[PDB]
Amino acid sequence: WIPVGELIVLNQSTGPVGRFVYTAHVAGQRNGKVVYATGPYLTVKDHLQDD
């Protein structure tokens, strides 16, 4: 991962540098409205009544 012959150098403090934000996506139809969820999501598509 660290390329051979090249080194990173931290400067201030060995700690966290920023945060990996997520962003909301679309889920649907709570009652007649939309509901948004933040992180990763896995939606299925049950087309077992299709041809």
Partner: peptide, 24 residues
């Protein structure tokens, strides 16, 4: 479409994306 139903806030405030459920 998706781009309006996901990205829709207001103008003055920092409102979350649930505005289109009021605009429908």
């Amino acid at each position: 479409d998706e781009k309006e139903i996901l990205y829709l806030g207001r103008l003055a405030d920092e409102v979350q994306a649930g505005v289109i459920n009021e605009q429908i």
